């Protein structure tokens, strides 16, 4: 009758639907796609932001920008890391979600946050110039 103790809640989702709902229009933010967002799905959003607001414009190159190029796993993760880094530097909030899980389809609860954070940055007209490079060079 009373089962749970999982994590992925409806709240963490309602936050993303609005977080990205504004910054970007497509793809459509659905409780489903928001919980089972494929490496590809997210890719669209990430890029969209750079085309919508511009945030992290110098983060990805012509190659990276094109998901097609990305095929190997090791890459999928390395691609997400770039953003995950900046987003954190800009927003200023430590994230746990790993790019090795979301890419597969796990630890969705957290994934939602990652998107919520990014949206905020743009919402507050917060651009990224230093962070972008920092991660690019691999600073710490």
Residue 62 lies in a domain: yes
Contact 57, 71 (CB under 8 A): no
Residue 75 lies in a domain: yes
Query: What CATH number has the domain bearing residue 122?
Result: 1.10.418.50
Residue 58 lies in a domain: yes
Question: CA-CA distance, 107 to 28, in Å (whole number)?
Answer: 21
Domain holding 85, by residue range, is: 10-140
Give the count of domains, the chain: 1
Residue 118 lies in a domain: yes
């Amino acid at each position: 009758g009373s089962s749970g103790s999982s994590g992925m809640n409806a709240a963490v989702v309602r936050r993303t639907q609005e977080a990205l709902g504004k910054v970007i229009r497509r793809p459509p933010l659905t409780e489903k796609l928001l919980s089972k967002p494929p490496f590809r799905y997210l890719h669209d959003i990430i890029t969209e932001v750079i085309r919508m607001t511009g945030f992290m414009k110098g983060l990805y190159t012509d190659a990276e920008m094109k998901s097609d190029n990305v095929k190997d796993k090791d890459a999928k993760i390395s691609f997400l890391q770039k953003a995950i880094d900046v987003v954190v530097m800009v927003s200023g909030e430590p994230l746990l979600a790993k790019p090795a899980r979301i890419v597969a389809g796990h630890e969705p609860e957290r994934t939602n946050e990652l998107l919520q954070i990014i949206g905020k940055c743009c919402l507050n007209k917060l651009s990224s110039d230093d962070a972008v490079r920092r991660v690019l060079a691999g600073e710490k």
